[PDB]
Amino acid sequence: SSSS
Amino acid sequence: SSSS
Amino acid sequence: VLERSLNRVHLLGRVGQDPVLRQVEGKNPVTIFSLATNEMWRSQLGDVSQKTTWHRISVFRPGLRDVAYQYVKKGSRIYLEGKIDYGEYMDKNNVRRQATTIIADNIIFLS
Amino acid sequence: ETTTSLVLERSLNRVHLLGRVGQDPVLRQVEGKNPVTIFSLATNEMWQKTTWHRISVFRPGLRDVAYQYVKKGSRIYLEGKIDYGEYMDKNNVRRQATTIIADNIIFLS
Amino acid sequence: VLERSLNRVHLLGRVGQDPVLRQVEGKNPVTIFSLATNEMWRSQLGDVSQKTTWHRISVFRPGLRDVAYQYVKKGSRIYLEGKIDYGEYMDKNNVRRQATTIIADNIIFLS
Amino acid sequence: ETTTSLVLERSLNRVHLLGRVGQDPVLRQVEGKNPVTIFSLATNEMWQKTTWHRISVFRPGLRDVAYQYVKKGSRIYLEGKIDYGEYMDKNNVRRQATTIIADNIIFLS
Ligand SMILES: [Mg+2]
Ligand SMILES: [Mg+2]
Ligand SMILES: [Mg+2]
Secondary structure, eight states, X not given: XXXX | XXXX | OOOOOEEEEEEEEEEOSOOEEEOOTTSOOEEEEEEEEEEXXXXXXXXXXXXXXXXXXXXOSHHHHHHHHHHOOTTOXXXXXXXXXXXXXXXXXXXXXXXXXXXXXXXXXXO | OOSSOOOOOOOEEEEEEEEEXXXXXXXXXXXXXXXXXXXXXXXXXXXXXXXXXXXXEOSTTHHHHHHHXXXXXXXXXXXXXXXXXXXXXXXXXXXXXXXXXXXXXXXXX | OOOOOEEEEEEEEEEOSOOEEEOOTTXXXXXXXXXXXXXXXXXXXXXXXXXXXXXXEEEXXXXXXXXXXXXXXXXXXXXXXXXXXXXXXXXXXXXXXXXXXXEEEEEEEOO | OOSSOOOOOOOEEEEEEEEEEOXXXXXXXXXXXXXXXXXXXXXXXXXXXXXXXXXXXOSTTHHHHHHHHOOTTOEEXXXXXXXXXXXXXXXXXXXXXXXXXXXXXXXXX
């Protein structure tokens, strides 16, 4: 999970 | 190389 | 009043032969031509596959139909937009067969 | 035509459809090896005429999402390319079986 | 007579807040709202990245502008088409700064 | 917002441009690591107004083809997504640096  |  | 739908095709390719200006008596005149698009996709040396797709283009719109007949040539590179229409028709049997065309409403000459 | 007939020259074959699914999707295998999800999509023009499209989903993952979530009456936006699916019927007649091969499906209902 | 060009955007996303009906005296009334689109892309467990892009939408077309103001709501899922316009403007300095909007000419309500 | 904020719900961010390249492409690095090819593209509306787009090519391979073959005055068709490139300038002012990130380029001239 990665969110900019 | 491939051609249908 | 049916809701909104979309049927929109964009093609950019090379014309396969000089257009036909077709008037099959009854239906109004139509410019017909073919457009080739290539799809390339990978599969020693780099093994890559290529397929050519041949689209039938119909131009019914009165001003565009004439521009298409006079200016589209074999080998012409063009961009076009339209809708797909499958041309259902009853043959000699009691069912339907299809004659798919893209009905162009916009053409851009790229050559 | 050669091996040098690379045709790096690019072209564009792109269709966008927004409409309603005619029946529940079905699953088929093409040749012996490529699973595909198939359904119908209806679009309309003001002018009236309902245009019925055959949608094929070959992309892995997308094809399973389509089969599990597309249902008769679903409203769908999708994008892909046209394949005319030419073939020879029983009596040597060349037929078209035009399909839109969807590479993107957005679920609206 | 300049040749043909294209400037065409397609968005499908969720509206970020209730629209503003804006009449800055002088320029004609405009419906303004924001549209969010998500871009997901991969990078133990399946590591996946997500980015939300926030588009400013302007509707100038007289009938569409009112339909947009009355029916677009926060959370509304819509499809729209338009052109990108960067809104160049001179600030207090001797150069230009940009206020990018998408000028919608077609909106489909999907909710 | 969680890890369960997966937002599998799909959206669409697609731009198509056809126009003329303003100047020869240049090559930049973003952060320390991502090579990018950048050029300008002009489109026109009948109404007149020339709209000037900033094109960025991040895709490997495409970015090199772009840098080697796009030239000032080139006619180009391209597709991609809009990125508004927001940032803070020298004086804490939030600016936009809108760019079209091209994932497909077709060369016309
Ligand atoms: Mg699968
Ligand atoms: Mg498109
Ligand atoms: Mg590279």
